[PDB]
Write a protein that binds this ligand. Structure first.
Ligand code: MET
Length: 235
């Protein structure tokens, strides 16, 4: 059968519904292999442990390919999950004090993403002209302090920071809703739609293409609504 890698949590639930559709509508057997770190499913795909994965956006894929040299490609988009800014210390962004701590993901692409969101929030300005680092902060009026944490740690940081940019797959299990709890989220038209990735040699495999189709099925869209609400947008 087809082995597909996901990150444990809400997206794995989504994949469970896709797996049912795959069997019932496509006669395809899908075995879901869960992981607990963003940095792992691409290694599992590269080494043959899984045949596809569904957990990342294109900038993340490009970044890890540059780091590791994996021969992996996207065969289609699933959903975009607009990233939110969350806090347990403020209800409005203007409440931020001088020198407040803002936590962001520490991996290159999601860190750049979070910095772009802080800029959208009018908290900072980045040097003029996807790979942004705090060194690219040109304006920081409130002298906010950027704290770089692993993505899976951000949801537990809210007792120690004033604001955090958190990926939706991690926010939800922490009881945080992008629609209900975020002070601000990205727009829907970002470069961060998630994808199904496969080995380069398998890009034309009809069974892997069928997984993409199943993930666009009415049943999967309906399940996305129940799991993510407005926090997931079909892509
Ligand atoms: C591993 S790249 C980030 C993926 C995560 N599901 C997001 O859309 O924010």
């Amino acid at each position: 059968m087809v082995r597909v890698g996901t990150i444990a949590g809400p997206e794995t639930q989504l994949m469970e519904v896709a797996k049912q559709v795959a069997l019932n509508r496509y006669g395809l057997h899908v075995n879901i292999i869960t992981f607990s770190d963003y940095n792992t499913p691409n290694e599992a795909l590269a080494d043959g442990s899984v045949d596809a994965n569904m957990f990342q956006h294109l900038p993340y894929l490009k970044a890890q390919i540059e780091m590791r040299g994996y021969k992996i490609v996207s065969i289609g988009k699933t959903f975009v999950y607009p990233m939110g800014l969350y806090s347990k210390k403020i209800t409005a962004l203007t409440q931020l004090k001088t020198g407040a701590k803002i936590a962001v993901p520490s991996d290159p692409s999601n860190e750049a993403r979070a910095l772009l969101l802080l800029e959208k929030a009018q908290l900072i300005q980045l040097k003029t002209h996807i790979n942004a680092t705090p060194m690219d902060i040109a304006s920081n009026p409130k002298k906010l302090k950027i704290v770089e944490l692993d993505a899976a740690q951000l949801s537990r940081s809210l007792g120690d920071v004033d604001l955090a940019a958190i990926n939706t797959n991690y926010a939800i299990p922490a009881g945080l809703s992008p629609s209900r709890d975020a002070l601000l989220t990205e727009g829907p038209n970002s470069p961060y739609a998630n994808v199904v990735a496969v080995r380069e040699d398998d890009k034309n495999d009809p069974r892997l293409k069928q997984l993409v189709s199943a993930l666009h099925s009415p049943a999967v869209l309906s399940a996305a609504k129940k799991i993510f609400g407005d926090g997931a947008i079909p892509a």
